[PDB]
Amino acid sequence: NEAEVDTALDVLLELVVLNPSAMMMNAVFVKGILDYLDNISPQQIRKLFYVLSTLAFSKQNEASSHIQDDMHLVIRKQLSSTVFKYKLIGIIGAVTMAGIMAADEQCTQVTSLLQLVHSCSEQSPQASALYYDEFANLIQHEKLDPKALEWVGHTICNDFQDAFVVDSCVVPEGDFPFPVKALYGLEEYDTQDGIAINLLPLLFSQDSPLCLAPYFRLLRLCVERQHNGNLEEIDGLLDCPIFLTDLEPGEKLESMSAKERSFMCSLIFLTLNWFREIVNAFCQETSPEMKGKVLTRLKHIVELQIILEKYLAVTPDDIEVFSILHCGLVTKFILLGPPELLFLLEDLSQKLESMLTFSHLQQRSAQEIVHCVFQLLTPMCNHLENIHNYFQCLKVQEYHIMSSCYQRLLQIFHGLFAWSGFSQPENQNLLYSALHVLSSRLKQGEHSQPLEELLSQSVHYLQNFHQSIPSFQCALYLIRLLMVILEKSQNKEKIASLARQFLCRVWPNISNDQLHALLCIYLEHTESILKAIEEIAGVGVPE
Amino acid sequence: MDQKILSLAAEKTADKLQEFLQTLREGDLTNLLQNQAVKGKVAGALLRAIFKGSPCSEEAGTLRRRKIYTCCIQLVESGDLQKEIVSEIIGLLMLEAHHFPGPLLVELANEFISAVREGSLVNGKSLELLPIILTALATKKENLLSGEECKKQLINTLCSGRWDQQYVIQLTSMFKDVPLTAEEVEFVVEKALSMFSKMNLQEIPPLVYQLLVLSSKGSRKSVLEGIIAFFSALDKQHNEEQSPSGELRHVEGTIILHIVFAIKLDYELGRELVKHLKVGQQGDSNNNLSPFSIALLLSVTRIQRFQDQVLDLLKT
Amino acid sequence: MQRASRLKRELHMLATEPPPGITCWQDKDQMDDLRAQILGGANTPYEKGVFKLEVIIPERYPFEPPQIRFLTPIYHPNIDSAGRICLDVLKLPPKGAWRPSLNIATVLTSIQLLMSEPNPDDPLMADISSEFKYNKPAFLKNARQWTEKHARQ
């Protein structure tokens, strides 16, 4: 199993970098693995090919080049195959193998190798994507001979600027049953420029553009490795409008659900992942105009995210970017918008759920995510929490959005507070500050207080949201949050009374799983479980 | 006349080259063979042209693609061309073999069966395509009888026909990479086992290794029953000859060790061995076990999981 | 150290009783390197040829084969113009066949032998190998002229 595999592999990596000469005798046994790549996942494959390749292209062990030829063999053979699973392995192997051999005929070897993988991988869309993803991963992780990167960058730039990038002429080419314009420009850019993107005509000619975002990532990272993070060649690209349908209404085109719906949902999905990759690109840049464009792009992302989650409702079946979350709410109904908040909080929840219980975030430590989020959630999402409490204390679509915003806010708080690094003492400094800001949300001045006092003030702040809660899930999240704070400290009665209150409300529905979790929250924490069950079984009858 | 196809490819696809096919018409043997003899770098480029030039959307591209294949199989084989060119040209013939309609690949595979009957397969580098074509036949589920049925009868004809005694092992190393069923792997390996008899001994061990790594997605009962029944017969004949020892001892051993390094990664291999070598009722133990079966077991006692099980059987 | 003993024996055995038509001496210019000579074989296009070789014995010799080049250009199916020899006994196994059972004398013998009988299956010059296979006369002529151009005095 996978951790055994991983650990062994790490051991092998350690042993080869430590003592090559000893394992080079028995590298033969390691060559004999290659029959049983049938039971290894892609990631392990990367390290495996790394080891064998650092064996062979260690400079004394090139007399024993048998390894080198045999893996060349399985490369081209495995790489060849029609079936994606096999093509996959060879793809990754080739890429990683190429990486390490390149640290003049070696440059011709990697050239031939990368050209043939690119040529073979052109035909399958999934594989083309994978190449660009994997080649990007390789160029980023490895510092490798800038001649080869100077070779690949001039290829990728040219192929990108002819493949996708077209003129910003206001009429696109294609007989479309849709008002196709150049939408989601910044409009601060010069609109009569050359650089635009042929997204929807490529998507209609499909029925290459699903590989668009990672291909841009690849181009950028060749450019980032060459010019050392100077993005003055590209910064005309976040200026571009994108050739799309008028997406903004998904209510005028309701109850005519065709393959048009699949087209539209996939179109918005690519547009947002495109925009996510632009934010991934230009996040490192400190220039204020660039950051302004990135904020405008987040507003474009977030409004299309509301249209996409709403399109999935009608049709059934980085972290430094949250430095923009310092922007406060401008709630459209009562008077960073509501769709801005739902998208950013949906993003941070979908990251933290995978990460703490995805390659860019996974190459960062979980401790790095928790440390940075403490500055980047609490003292500006408590503002958004307070505005949500103000709104819900007092038309339909913004209520449905801000209920879900409120759910997501409490979900990110629960993910933060349920972290298993806080029984461990080094993270208790973070917890003292975290409760010191939640205690300091109501009134300040009480500093260097005992832990239990900070816990009681934090839960006293978090408990009095209970009247404003619009939906059952936010209630359950609030009680699970109060439980994971109060277990640090008596409060059984509090959790029981609150669970009982939220079982006693009307709730205009409720899924069985949420109500199961709330009943086990009530009955376990009640003073007498027997008299609690006899209370529910002397009301279970007058139903 | 080589720099009047580089221009043709340098601009656009199937417009001038699909016609440039119908113009020349003579034979892509002089244009490769004699062109290769001087400079093969041309051939690695050239084929990129013809193939982009002869797209399979049209049948007069497809039969020009079906002939260039029948050519370059035969030239790499009979031809003492360099390794370096062959490592490319095959690379191409693999890389492009994916997108064919049904009845051309069965004919290419019939050429391959005809070659395994007769042809001087002086390198089975020619048969490096034979794995991926049975893949690309199976992915096209359309009636040409479907693709998988044609694959089944095709590998039945590979098994029924005589194997090149020289490179029988190299043919058996190809069914390693194809996905197969039980019946298919069983047919191919019981023929690879019929072939131990009609060989030198010193090449039986690596063949046994390439049988076991196949048997990992196939029959184990069969692989080890074959090795055991074979060496059982061998040692009995060595005994009644005594009533070729100094090497018969190297083989038995090297085999036990090669089956060790497999039962090491394949815990089910060991369990099937052990089940095969049960006493159960004492009448199975008076047809099962051997002077070779037991050296093999008493090597096996070194595996940590397996020591104990083994001994207990032997003792009882 | 196996180097020192091998060199001492082989040098003097090759200085006093070499194989016929073959010489091998400690290169005067490079007394770590060797100079080898193959005399043009009777009944071959290499007839009337003196073929100079640079014979470097790797430091791990005799556990590794010699690295030997023709200094004399030769027109041969299995030997390019730069002098590289396609022969298993100059590579470690499983591909090659080198072991300390063999030596400078027996491999210079295997070389003179290949010069007599080219093996077309390991072709360095595909043109020369196909001309050897189909047009013996043209090969023999170009090779004999090659002998009189490059292996002459």
DSSP string across A245-293: ---S-SSSS-S--SHHHHHHHHHHHHHHHHHHHHHHHHTS---HHHHHH
* A241 closest CA partner among A292, A323, A180: A180
Q: Which residues of A touch C90 (CB under 8 A)?
A: none
- Which residues in chain B have their C atom more than 2.5 Å from the N of the next written residue, marking a break after them? 144, 243
How far apart (Å, rounded) are the C-alpha atoms in residues A223 and A233? 9
Two structure tokens written together for B12:
């656009």
**Could you give the angle at which helices B182-194 and B220-242 cross, rounded to 10 degrees?**
20
Do B98 and A123 make contact, defined as CB atoms within 8 angstroms? yes
How far apart (Å, rounded) are the C-alpha atoms in residues A369 and A351? 10
How far apart (Å, rounded) are the C-alpha atoms in residues C70 and C51? 7
**Could you give the angle at which helices A146-163 and A105-121 cross, rounded to 10 degrees?**
30
How far apart (Å, rounded) are the C-alpha atoms in residues A122 and A131? 9
* A403 closest CA partner among A414, A417, A391: A391
Backbone angles phi, psi at C46, to 5 degrees: -85, -10
Rounded to whole angstroms, the maximal C-alpha distance in chain B is 81
Closest-CA distance of chain C to residue A64, Å: 9
Query: Is the distance from CB of A385 to CB of A319 less than 8 angstroms?
Result: no
Do A66 and C95 make contact, defined as CB atoms within 8 angstroms? yes
Backbone angles phi, psi at C69, to 5 degrees: -115, 140
Q: Give resolution, Å, one decimal.
A: 4.2
User: Which DSSP string corresponds to A140-177?
Assistant: HH----HHHHHHHHHHHHHHHHHHTEE---SSPSS--S
Query: Is the distance from CB of A193 to CB of A236 less than 8 angstroms?
Result: yes
Subunits with 3+ Cβ pairs within 8 Å of C are A, B
First to last CA, chain B: 81
- How many angstroms separate the Cα of C111 from the Cα of each of A27, C44, C51, C128, C142? 33, 14, 12, 18, 20
Query: Is the distance from CB of A400 to CB of A418 less than 8 angstroms?
Result: no
DSSP helix/strand/coil, A196: strand
Half-sphere exposure of B225 (CA within 13 A, CB side): 13
How far apart (Å, rounded) are the C-alpha atoms in residues C36 and C108? 9
C2-153: CATH topology: Ubiquitin Conjugating Enzyme (3.10.110)
- How many angstroms separate the Cα of B246 from the Cα of each of B197, B243, B251? 19, 18, 10
Q: Which chain C residue lies closest to B81 (C-alpha atoms)? A: C126
Torsion, CA A320, CA A324, CA A325, CA A330, rounded to 10: -170
* A250 closest CA partner among A260, A237, A241: A260
Neighbouring CB atoms inside 10 A of A122's CB total 12
β-pair partners for C146: none
How far apart (Å, rounded) are the C-alpha atoms in residues B315 and B294? 12
Domain ranges of chain C: 2-153
Residues of C marked active site are found at 86
b/e code B164-174 from CB counts within 10 Å (16+ = b)? beebbbbbbbb
Torsion, CA B68, CA B71, CA B75, CA B76, rounded to 10: 60
Question: C-alpha angle A363/A368/A374, rounded to 5°?
Answer: 145
How far apart (Å, rounded) are the C-alpha atoms in residues A289 and A477? 39
Closest-CA distance of chain B to residue A125, Å: 14
Is B34 exposed, middle or buried, given 0-12, 13-18 or 19+ CB atoms closer than 10 A? exposed
Query: Is the distance from CB of A78 to CB of A89 less than 8 angstroms?
Result: yes
β-pair partners for A363: none
Residues of C with CB under 8 A from a CB of B: 77, 120-124, 126-127, 129-130, 133
* A50 closest CA partner among A24, A84, A76, A13: A13
* A281 closest CA partner among A226, A219, A358: A219
Residue A475 backbone class (left: φ over 0; alpha: ψ -120 to 50; beta: rest) = alpha
DSSP classification of residue A470: -
Query: Is the distance from CB of C152 to CB of C48 less than 8 angstroms?
Result: yes
* C35 closest CA partner among C75, C71, C59: C71
Query: Is the distance from CB of B106 to CB of B144 less than 8 angstroms?
Result: yes
Task: Please name the residues in contact with B251: beta carbons below 8 A apart, sequence gap of 6 or more.
Answer: B201, B202, B204, B205
Task: Please name the residues in contact with C107: beta carbons below 8 A apart, sequence gap of 6 or more.
Answer: C65, C66, C68, C89, C90
Three-state SS across chain C? CHHHHHHHHHHHHHHHCCCCCEEEEECCCCCCCEEEEEECCCCCCCCCCEEEEEEECCCCCCCCCCEEEECCCCCECCECCCCCECCHHHCCCCCCCCCCCCCHHHHHHHHHHHHHCCCCCCCCCHHHHHHHHHCHHHHHHHHHHHHHHHCCC
Is B80 exposed, middle or buried, given 0-12, 13-18 or 19+ CB atoms closer than 10 A? middle
Neighbouring CB atoms inside 10 A of A346's CB total 19
How far apart (Å, rounded) are the C-alpha atoms in residues B206 and A488? 64
Three-state SS across B104-162? HHHHHHHHHHHHHHCCCCCCHHHHHCHHHHHHHHHHCCCCCCCHHHHHHHHHHHHHHCC
Q: In what order do the strands lie in the sheet with A181-183?
A: A165-166, A196-197, A242-244, A181-183
Q: Is residue A69 within 8 angstroms of chain C, CB to CB?
A: no
Subunits with 3+ Cβ pairs within 8 Å of A are B, C
Closest-CA distance of chain C to residue B9, Å: 28
CB-closest option in B94, B136, B216 to A76 = B94
* C83 closest CA partner among C92, C96, C72: C72
Residue written as tokens 């041969």?
C76
β-pair partners for C76: C79
Instruction: Give just the sign of the alpha carbon dihedral A130, A131, A134, A137.
Output: negative
Half-sphere exposure of C138 (CA within 13 A, CB side): 10
Q: Which amino acid is at C93?
A: P
DSSP helix/strand/coil, A42: helix
